[PDB]
Amino acid sequence: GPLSMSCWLREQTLLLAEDYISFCSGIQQTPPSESAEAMRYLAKEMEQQHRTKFRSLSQEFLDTCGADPSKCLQSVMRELVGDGKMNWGRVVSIFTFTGVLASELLSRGENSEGSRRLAETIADYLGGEKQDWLVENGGWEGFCRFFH
């Protein structure tokens, strides 16, 4: 059912977000899944292509958000897709931005708990709010094949 699928998509997304965030946090481990290998490559490609802008955005974000970065990230994700359209490129940017955000929070002395909250925010949004789009596009296996 829709609830069963959403729960599964949320967990699949959480694993993916947790892996990318860890990858951005100095941890070196083999990708746990083909989708993780793909996201590591694609999200770092997007960062390398816009590194200064992502860095500036992450610092502005954290300086204007305050107490709850996860809540602020939900509002950004909502505005990113605020034109009703959804595609894998926008998903990649969410991962790229959150990876830079996580790295900046670590640089500022924060614990890994904040990282986990950001991963759960991505998972809840894509696996819950965007479950229909994710399913119709084949989920993270479709993400893999779309980018060959």
Next chain:
Amino acid sequence: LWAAKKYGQQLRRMSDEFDKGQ
């Protein structure tokens, strides 16, 4: 124009460029 919309639009434009190269 407020922060969340500013950041969302910035990410949108970078996503569009990523699609142009893919």
